[PDB]
Amino acid sequence: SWAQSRDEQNLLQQKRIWESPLLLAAKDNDVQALNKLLKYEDCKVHQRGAMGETALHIAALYDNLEAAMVLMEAAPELVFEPMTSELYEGQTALHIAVVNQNMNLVRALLARRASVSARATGTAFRRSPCNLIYFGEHPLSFAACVNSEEIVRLLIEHGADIRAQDSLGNTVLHILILQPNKTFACQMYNLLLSYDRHGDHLQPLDLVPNHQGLTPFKLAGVEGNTVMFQHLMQKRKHTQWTYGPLTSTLYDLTEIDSSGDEQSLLELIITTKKREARQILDQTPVKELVSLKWKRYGRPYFCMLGAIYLLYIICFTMCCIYRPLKPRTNNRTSPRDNTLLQQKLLQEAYMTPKDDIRLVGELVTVIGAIIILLVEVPDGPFHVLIITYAFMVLVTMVMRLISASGEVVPMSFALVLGWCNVMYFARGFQMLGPFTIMIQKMIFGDLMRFCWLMAVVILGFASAFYIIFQTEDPEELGHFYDYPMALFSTFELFLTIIDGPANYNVDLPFMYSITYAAFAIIATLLMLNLLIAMMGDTHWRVAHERDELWRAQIVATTVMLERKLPRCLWPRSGICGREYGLGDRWFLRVEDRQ
Amino acid sequence: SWAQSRDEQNLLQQKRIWESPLLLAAKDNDVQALNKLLKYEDCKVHQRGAMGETALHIAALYDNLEAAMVLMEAAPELVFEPMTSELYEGQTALHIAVVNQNMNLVRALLARRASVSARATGTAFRRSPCNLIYFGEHPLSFAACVNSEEIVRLLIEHGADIRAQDSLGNTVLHILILQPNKTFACQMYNLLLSYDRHGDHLQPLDLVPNHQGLTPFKLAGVEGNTVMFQHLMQKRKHTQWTYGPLTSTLYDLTEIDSSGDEQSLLELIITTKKREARQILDQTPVKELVSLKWKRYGRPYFCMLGAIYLLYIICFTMCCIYRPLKPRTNNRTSPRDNTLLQQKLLQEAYMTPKDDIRLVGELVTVIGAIIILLVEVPDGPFHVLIITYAFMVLVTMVMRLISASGEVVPMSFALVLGWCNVMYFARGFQMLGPFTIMIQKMIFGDLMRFCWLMAVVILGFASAFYIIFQTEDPEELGHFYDYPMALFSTFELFLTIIDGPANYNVDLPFMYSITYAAFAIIATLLMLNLLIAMMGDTHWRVAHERDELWRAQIVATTVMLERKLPRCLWPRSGICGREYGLGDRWFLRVEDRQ
Ligand SMILES: CCCCCCCC/C=C\CCCCCCCC(=O)O[C@@H](COC(=O)CCCCCCCCCCCCCCC)COP(=O)([O-])OCC[N+](C)(C)C
Ligand SMILES: CCCCCCCC/C=C\CCCCCCCC(=O)O[C@@H](COC(=O)CCCCCCCCCCCCCCC)COP(=O)([O-])OCC[N+](C)(C)C
Ligand SMILES: CCCCCCCC/C=C\CCCCCCCC(=O)O[C@@H](COC(=O)CCCCCCCCCCCCCCC)COP(=O)([O-])OCC[N+](C)(C)C
Ligand SMILES: CCCCCCCC/C=C\CCCCCCCC(=O)O[C@@H](COC(=O)CCCCCCCCCCCCCCC)COP(=O)([O-])OCC[N+](C)(C)C
Ligand SMILES: CC(C)CCC[C@@H](C)[C@H]1CC[C@@H]2[C@H]3CC=C4C[C@H](OC(=O)CCC(=O)O)CC[C@]4(C)[C@@H]3CC[C@@]21C
Ligand SMILES: CC(C)CCC[C@@H](C)[C@H]1CC[C@@H]2[C@H]3CC=C4C[C@H](OC(=O)CCC(=O)O)CC[C@]4(C)[C@@H]3CC[C@@]21C
Ligand SMILES: CC(C)CCC[C@@H](C)[C@H]1CC[C@@H]2[C@H]3CC=C4C[C@H](OC(=O)CCC(=O)O)CC[C@]4(C)[C@@H]3CC[C@@]21C
Ligand SMILES: CC(C)CCC[C@@H](C)[C@H]1CC[C@@H]2[C@H]3CC=C4C[C@H](OC(=O)CCC(=O)O)CC[C@]4(C)[C@@H]3CC[C@@]21C
Ligand SMILES: CC(C)CCC[C@@H](C)[C@H]1CC[C@@H]2[C@H]3CC=C4C[C@H](OC(=O)CCC(=O)O)CC[C@]4(C)[C@@H]3CC[C@@]21C
Ligand SMILES: [Ca+2]
Ligand SMILES: [Ca+2]
């Protein structure tokens, strides 16, 4: 399909080199083969192939200085060449010898008036996961990424705009953050900003956003580039006083903190898929800012929401304890029919003043449900449950207003959805927070992978056991009446949570006692203690990084509280300017000791 | 509040520097800006701000030699300056340039008759956890802590008392033990004691106590400073003979052992909150002294107390086995009323001579209870239980003397409080001692953190299950009658200590079998084996450091036995002086091999 075609275009490129001898001698520099063909007939000086390549392209792509130079006097009208077939579209040979770091050949290109503007918008230059280089779309963006100091100075002299944006809006400082060698990215970064000693009006190149709106300070935090992040912090510092080993220092907090309706750096670190971005979250202004927001305004508001939710769940719980039951009207259709009670009706529900006090609690309940949805629906996993909990009150609101069957099951959902959301509020404690991360990674990581192997062993053995108690007396190790019940027995004999079956009274069915021994060795010993050994590794894995998993829970919570509460209750953190003479910016003081 | 105000006072300091140009040019040395203002109008030569700072202070705090010297001829009447607003109170600039290690500027201060006496009693110099330096309150105490060898010699020449005590009584040798760099603390320590070649009367500076009474030998043991501790031991040694690889050595034991009613070093290491202090407990005189006290007098007395307590608990146990029961008077109020017996009365209790022998045992019991309280109340966790055990005998003493209901429950406390105090006496064995440390750290470390998450899952599911068996026949998986009993069922289905419920006889309630499968995956597999993986780490953690946890149990026990037993049964450990000609001190011989 796609990658098949891309490999075909590589060898069909290899074919048309071997077709034309001018294209062939461009690869291996046979100057004899070159200057024979040039002193001959015209012989297709700009004939293209599948990709749009030329002989000057191939001599550059296979590192031929001499074969290219002889071709230059032969045809100087070429050099402005857009290699263009949908995947290489825009690329020049002046792109090529820069990526190959060929300083002699790009000198001859800039001698013949090369184009340091050319936008390589071909799909092998997009920022995609299927293209394992992203160097930009410009020669100066190419020269920067490959650590090519000489050429970088050379290109700008010939008119290479340091400010030019590619088809994602990224400047060359945005592209240097995306490079995998984080240390060599730093040195080429300063060389481009040094040359921006001109042009300080309109965001002097280290404030210019892309189409996403991010600056190179905020993009280093989103991409997790901590080395570039600690570099750019030094511009946003201010040493204040150095009394011995003490040191006071102000941090800038204009792009780190919530400037306005813009997405702050703490919002973008939480709302990203990249895992390395959460190592920004303990750097020297950020860790102090989160601790200041949590200890002074985040933890008091979170504990008061945790207490109001705890009373509301009791005010839910006590109403569904006292739910309208009555003795039944009809009688037993079977001896197995074994209810002794029945749901009451709304007409005869609220008769006493005792029940008048009850419906207060249920009106506290239902009003709480529409408050939840009006908060949440106009927008992690506890978001899903609290929407499901509000849904389950408004289900059994509807079912009682038309007085129908099965109130219990929408409530049977509701309690465990309701009370396990108190475990949400366990993140407000250092020593209880990452316990819920353990619970998740065991379910979605260890249960949901091994569960398929457990259920295969169930349906194997539970069918195997149900043909042994089908032709028997169903009260006498009646652990198997039904393929439903046999899936309920073997689920609870795998786990050893009910008794391993035996009756020891009657002449027992034979093949069973062979079979349950086969079962109990492989289920209750081998595959149950597989899972216990699995989840023991998950516990060890999450308890190891337990501090940094809790800190990411606090940043997620503090951002969530700050956006939704009104500004008159969440004061802006830090010390304001304009009275201490620093600017209108909002700073933060940190004092340390070395 | 507090730290908010402290940061405001740092930037308001930064404001009033930027207000007055004399204060501004004190920071960055603009001598031009200085000598313009000085050849002008008087212009407030000693105007203060919020903190009481001066221009000579700011030039010293921001390291200006030249700006300070020009200011000295301008106003030589300053230098005696008490910077004084409640938090900086007492501090001189002569304090400041010493902490900044500015040897040229303090030369010009001592040229202009500086004050090496000044007591920086401001709250930013107290020994508090919120001030992360404690260098003392004096310039010589400052110069010592910052490792400033040159200035330390210089100050004493200008009359810096090495013996001066700050507002906690600590001398400079006390303050050098509190410094975090333990190796550089040692070298500056000797330089101050070398200069105490004068003044040997009245405790020659290495015996002088603070207001707590501690010497620098005993303070190094309380603070856990093992490097300073092994240093000061060398003064308290005596090599005795060196026969080949053998070596005999006497240790001093005047401050290590219990000199009298004073608090010995072994008492202060146990009664401290610092954790590093228990690494003193295996140094070369201390480890031999504890082993000598334990093997010769501690372990015999502890095993005899462990045997007398074991007989007393049997003498408690057998009486509350034979407790006054009789057949009941009334009859069954319900079929569920199912006692077949009743408490007897004190009148008809002691009728036979068999019961006369019983009350002997109970008088052994009660006398044992008031002995415990008369021992203990006029003063760790086994202290709390043995006071609670003595309380529970004297509860059921009172209840029988007025012949009332419920003897059993104060006794039901009493047994498990009584017999688990035998586990106290497991510290008298090397291989049984730190088992009780495991039991504590699992309860207060692993249970009491995760218990909140277990109970949340209980009330979630046990409410969820109790609405499924409310409208049923309560004898048929009657594991749920009551929200009390449902909290008792789900506590014992979480733990899988009772059978996972099933009846398999009647048409079963439907939503239950969905729900218990939801429950048994998350309770009996996921969250129960969370705790087993948690407490397995606690076991590994305590069994790793199991020798040094047992040795701290012995020091705690030996000190406790020695204080309470009379002196005529606990002889003073070691070899006395005054007959072997060493002094009146009590020494200890150790023989080793290298
Ligand atoms: C990890 C997730 C695992 C999910 C599955 C775990 C189980 C959850 C499944 C279902 C959840 C609950 C729904 C009930 C469905 C069963 C219907 C039933 O029992 O009816 C009948 C049986 O009929 C059957 O046996 C149907 C089952 C076919 C074999 C299993 C395939 C389904 C899953 C496999 C997919 C492979 C996935 C695994 C590998 C990829 C009942 O018969 P009876 O009334 O007793 O008749 C008496 C006979 N007499 C009349 C002669 C006297
Ligand atoms: C994980 C592995 C664990 C083992 C699990 C087994 C794995 C496979 C093992 C063995 C596979 C072979 C199974 C043959 C079964 C047919 C025999 C028969 O019909 O029984 C007859 C009984 O008479 C007997 O009991 C004779 C003995 C048969 C089994 C011999 C020991 C097998 C295990 C040796 C050691 C194992 C070596 C393990 C390797 C270390 C008939 O029974 P009945 O009572 O007369 O009446 C029946 C009436 N009914 C039909 C209505 C009910
Ligand atoms: C780690 C420590 C955990 C502590 C809690 C663990 C549990 C220990 C708690 C208590 C210990 C024992 C005391 C008994 C109290 C219950 C009273 C009761 O059952 O009465 C009644 C119910 O009423 C209730 O349901 C009250 C419980 C409200 C919800 C739970 C809140 C309390 C704990 C949560 C605090 C959050 C802390 C967790 C997160 C921060 C009994 O009802 P009935 O008689 O069957 O009536 C039949 C109805 N009929 C009349 C229609 C027929
Ligand atoms: C940790 C997770 C473990 C799973 C736990 C479950 C989690 C959530 C799962 C599912 C949520 C949805 C629940 C819907 C229940 C309502 C249906 C109903 O009313 O039943 C009817 C029965 O008729 C049936 O049995 C129809 C089948 C319903 C369930 C289908 C399989 C669900 C699990 C698929 C596989 C799971 C996939 C798991 C992912 C790998 C009514 O019953 P009745 O007998 O006719 O009479 C009732 C009388 N009574 C009211 C007095 C009692
Ligand atoms: C009816 C009376 C008693 C008024 C009180 C009702 C409260 C019980 C509810 C109403 C809506 C509120 C909620 C509003 C929305 C939020 C979402 C929040 O969602 C998450 O769990 C974040 C998910 C994640 O990050 O993993 C948790 C509950 C919270 C703070 C609130 C919890 C409690 C509140 C105050
Ligand atoms: C009543 C019957 C029909 C089923 C009810 C069981 C499940 C639907 C619920 C109830 C309790 C569980 C929850 C309990 C707690 C966890 C932690 C987890 O929290 C996190 O996301 C960790 C990261 C963070 O907190 O930020 C999210 C939900 C999860 C897996 C669970 C999701 C689903 C579970 C199995
Ligand atoms: C009535 C007749 C049988 C006389 C014998 C009574 C003994 C059973 C009791 C009386 C009070 C004594 C106690 C006195 C006080 C101490 C406190 C000691 O406290 C602790 O557990 C230390 C706590 C800790 O360091 O963690 C334990 C028991 C002990 C030695 C004694 C145990 C046994 C004694 C001899
Ligand atoms: C009868 C019912 C109502 C409750 C009785 C149970 C608890 C009150 C007691 C009985 C046994 C336990 C104790 C058993 C032994 C441990 C070891 C622990 O010993 C230590 O302090 C270790 C350090 C040292 O020994 O010096 C202190 C008490 C502890 C946790 C326990 C404290 C409380 C427990 C749970
Ligand atoms: C073995 C564990 C740790 C997890 C492995 C896979 C589970 C995801 C599967 C295995 C088979 C189970 C099923 C087994 C049979 C039941 C019957 C249930 O409804 C009924 O038919 C019985 C209701 C009644 O008896 O009235 C629906 C699905 C359920 C809980 C199960 C759903 C999920 C389970 C736990
Ligand atoms: Ca059982
Ligand atoms: Ca069992």
mmCIF file with all atom_site columns, N, CA and C in Angstrom, chain A residues 528-543:
data_model
loop_
_atom_site.group_PDB
_atom_site.id
_atom_site.type_symbol
_atom_site.label_atom_id
_atom_site.label_alt_id
_atom_site.label_comp_id
_atom_site.label_asym_id
_atom_site.label_entity_id
_atom_site.label_seq_id
_atom_site.pdbx_PDB_ins_code
_atom_site.Cartn_x
_atom_site.Cartn_y
_atom_site.Cartn_z
_atom_site.occupancy
_atom_site.B_iso_or_equiv
_atom_site.pdbx_formal_charge
_atom_site.auth_seq_id
_atom_site.auth_comp_id
_atom_site.auth_asym_id
_atom_site.auth_atom_id
_atom_site.pdbx_PDB_model_num
ATOM 1  N N  . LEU A 1 528 ? -4.508 -18.361 39.177 1.00 0.00 ? 528 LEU A N  1
ATOM 2  C CA . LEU A 1 528 ? -4.886 -17.314 40.116 1.00 0.00 ? 528 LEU A CA 1
ATOM 3  C C  . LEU A 1 528 ? -3.663 -16.637 40.705 1.00 0.00 ? 528 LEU A C  1
ATOM 4  N N  . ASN A 1 529 ? -2.612 -17.401 40.979 1.00 0.00 ? 529 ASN A N  1
ATOM 5  C CA . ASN A 1 529 ? -1.388 -16.832 41.511 1.00 0.00 ? 529 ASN A CA 1
ATOM 6  C C  . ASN A 1 529 ? -0.490 -16.284 40.414 1.00 0.00 ? 529 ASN A C  1
ATOM 7  N N  . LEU A 1 530 ? -0.809 -16.555 39.146 1.00 0.00 ? 530 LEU A N  1
ATOM 8  C CA . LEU A 1 530 ? -0.272 -15.747 38.057 1.00 0.00 ? 530 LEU A CA 1
ATOM 9  C C  . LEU A 1 530 ? -0.688 -14.297 38.195 1.00 0.00 ? 530 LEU A C  1
ATOM 10 N N  . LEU A 1 531 ? -1.980 -14.058 38.425 1.00 0.00 ? 531 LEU A N  1
ATOM 11 C CA . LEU A 1 531 ? -2.495 -12.695 38.466 1.00 0.00 ? 531 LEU A CA 1
ATOM 12 C C  . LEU A 1 531 ? -2.025 -11.968 39.715 1.00 0.00 ? 531 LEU A C  1
ATOM 13 N N  . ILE A 1 532 ? -1.889 -12.692 40.823 1.00 0.00 ? 532 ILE A N  1
ATOM 14 C CA . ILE A 1 532 ? -1.394 -12.096 42.058 1.00 0.00 ? 532 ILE A CA 1
ATOM 15 C C  . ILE A 1 532 ? 0.075  -11.718 41.915 1.00 0.00 ? 532 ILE A C  1
ATOM 16 N N  . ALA A 1 533 ? 0.839  -12.512 41.168 1.00 0.00 ? 533 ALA A N  1
ATOM 17 C CA . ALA A 1 533 ? 2.213  -12.133 40.872 1.00 0.00 ? 533 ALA A CA 1
ATOM 18 C C  . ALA A 1 533 ? 2.268  -10.984 39.873 1.00 0.00 ? 533 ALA A C  1
ATOM 19 N N  . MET A 1 534 ? 1.278  -10.895 38.978 1.00 0.00 ? 534 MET A N  1
ATOM 20 C CA . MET A 1 534 ? 1.219  -9.788  38.025 1.00 0.00 ? 534 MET A CA 1
ATOM 21 C C  . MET A 1 534 ? 0.936  -8.469  38.721 1.00 0.00 ? 534 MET A C  1
ATOM 22 N N  . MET A 1 535 ? -0.101 -8.437  39.556 1.00 0.00 ? 535 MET A N  1
ATOM 23 C CA . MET A 1 535 ? -0.494 -7.197  40.204 1.00 0.00 ? 535 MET A CA 1
ATOM 24 C C  . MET A 1 535 ? 0.487  -6.802  41.296 1.00 0.00 ? 535 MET A C  1
ATOM 25 N N  . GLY A 1 536 ? 1.299  -7.744  41.773 1.00 0.00 ? 536 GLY A N  1
ATOM 26 C CA . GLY A 1 536 ? 2.363  -7.384  42.691 1.00 0.00 ? 536 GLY A CA 1
ATOM 27 C C  . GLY A 1 536 ? 3.458  -6.585  42.016 1.00 0.00 ? 536 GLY A C  1
ATOM 28 N N  . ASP A 1 537 ? 3.662  -6.812  40.719 1.00 0.00 ? 537 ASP A N  1
ATOM 29 C CA . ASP A 1 537 ? 4.620  -6.009  39.967 1.00 0.00 ? 537 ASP A CA 1
ATOM 30 C C  . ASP A 1 537 ? 4.064  -4.621  39.687 1.00 0.00 ? 537 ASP A C  1
ATOM 31 N N  . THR A 1 538 ? 2.750  -4.526  39.476 1.00 0.00 ? 538 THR A N  1
ATOM 32 C CA . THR A 1 538 ? 2.115  -3.236  39.229 1.00 0.00 ? 538 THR A CA 1
ATOM 33 C C  . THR A 1 538 ? 2.158  -2.358  40.473 1.00 0.00 ? 538 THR A C  1
ATOM 34 N N  . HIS A 1 539 ? 1.951  -2.961  41.646 1.00 0.00 ? 539 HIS A N  1
ATOM 35 C CA . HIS A 1 539 ? 2.102  -2.251  42.912 1.00 0.00 ? 539 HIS A CA 1
ATOM 36 C C  . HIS A 1 539 ? 3.509  -1.706  43.095 1.00 0.00 ? 539 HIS A C  1
ATOM 37 N N  . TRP A 1 540 ? 4.514  -2.541  42.834 1.00 0.00 ? 540 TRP A N  1
ATOM 38 C CA . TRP A 1 540 ? 5.908  -2.141  42.957 1.00 0.00 ? 540 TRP A CA 1
ATOM 39 C C  . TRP A 1 540 ? 6.264  -1.036  41.971 1.00 0.00 ? 540 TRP A C  1
ATOM 40 N N  . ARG A 1 541 ? 5.621  -1.058  40.807 1.00 0.00 ? 541 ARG A N  1
ATOM 41 C CA . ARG A 1 541 ? 5.912  -0.094  39.757 1.00 0.00 ? 541 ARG A CA 1
ATOM 42 C C  . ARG A 1 541 ? 5.352  1.283   40.095 1.00 0.00 ? 541 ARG A C  1
ATOM 43 N N  . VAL A 1 542 ? 4.142  1.329   40.658 1.00 0.00 ? 542 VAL A N  1
ATOM 44 C CA . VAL A 1 542 ? 3.497  2.603   40.953 1.00 0.00 ? 542 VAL A CA 1
ATOM 45 C C  . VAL A 1 542 ? 3.983  3.186   42.277 1.00 0.00 ? 542 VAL A C  1
ATOM 46 N N  . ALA A 1 543 ? 4.254  2.346   43.279 1.00 0.00 ? 543 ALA A N  1
ATOM 47 C CA . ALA A 1 543 ? 4.805  2.813   44.546 1.00 0.00 ? 543 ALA A CA 1
ATOM 48 C C  . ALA A 1 543 ? 6.229  3.325   44.424 1.00 0.00 ? 543 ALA A C  1
#
